[PDB]
Amino acid sequence: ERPEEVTEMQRLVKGEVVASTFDEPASRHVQVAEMVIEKAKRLVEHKKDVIILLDSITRLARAYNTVVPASGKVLTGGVDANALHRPKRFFGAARNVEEGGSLTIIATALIDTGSKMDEVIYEEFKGTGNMELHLSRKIAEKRVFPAIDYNRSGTRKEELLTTQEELQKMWILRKIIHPMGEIDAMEFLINKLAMTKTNDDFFEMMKRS
Amino acid sequence: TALQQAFDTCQNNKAAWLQRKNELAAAEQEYLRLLSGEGRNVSRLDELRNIIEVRKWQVNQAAGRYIRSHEAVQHISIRDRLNDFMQQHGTALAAALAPELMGYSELTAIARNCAIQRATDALREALLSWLAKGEKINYSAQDSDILTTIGFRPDVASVDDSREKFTPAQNMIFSRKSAQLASRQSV
């Protein structure tokens, strides 16, 4: 990332933050990533809950591709098979531990930046996560913040994570939002959620309508 | 002893429902003290919602098991008493309703069904003839105090808890929630 972004990160989050900008070579990035992920694994081995904000899987994969020796089998985009194998287990370390502790990992990926390997890592990492959140450009052109895509957003095994009552109070919003467009749903939701203090009150405020 | 053991099982699952209600009341009291107090953490709140949903489902199914066990014991007692009385003095009401019983005995199946429904109407008008007086009586001799304690109409909370109904998929996922809650409680 840019130095200004990381230096305004150091003074914004109370938790410790580790980063290495693009000034350093890719070896520094990959060794930092491996060191920090293995330290997080050691920490969660102590039945301690750990949450990871990852930026970004595409940049990580590019760094490993640059640093890993070539395997002789290069697919589209100048990426060989063994390059993506390290980020595969890097991202796959997220799980919930039986006896205690939980490693949660939420990561971001670059979209349609014009470089042909970005969609390669995109397609390689699809289907390996418990859930995904999508964002678009046309929403942010009119500056409707956040630019999340409700329709494309989804989760796997929602039943175990929440209760049936709140999950049904979620599918009702799903059925409400499917008919009209995504952006129109964005203004609708932000407008009818602004005056309500909390989503819990919003539930009864909208059910009567 | 089938009636006695059925009533014993009814008391057993009624006591199980009582224990479920006690655990529920504990859940609401801890929930209210946590919300009234410094409920700073929310993960415990989410766990409370998770447990209370399946706890309502458990008390609903406990009310269901109690209600149809009560219906079962009531109907078995009623049929036993009817069999005993109607065998004691079968000839009396037999001669009272002889023609249609002869129609039933030596005719075809549809004629038998017609006899059944004619006897149904006859017994209905029989009951309507005498119910106007409404003189007070007691229970059966062998099953007086058992049915007095269990009562004809069950607890009001029992029927109130059965107002809501769950879809079979909802019932299955709530059973899964109960299983995982039991696993968590064991740990």
Curated annotation (Swiss-Prot), chain B:
Swiss-Prot/TrEMBL keywords: Late protein
Stretches assigned to coiled coil: none
Domain of life per record: Viruses
Gene Ontology biological-process entries: symbiont-mediated activation of host transcription
Alphabetical list of Gene3D superfamilies matching this protein: Phage polarity suppression protein monomer (1.20.58.1090)
Family matches, as Pfam families: Psu
Role noted for this protein: Late protein which functions to suppress polarity of amber mutations in the late genes of the P2 helper phage.
Name assigned to this protein: Polarity suppression protein
Primary gene name: psu
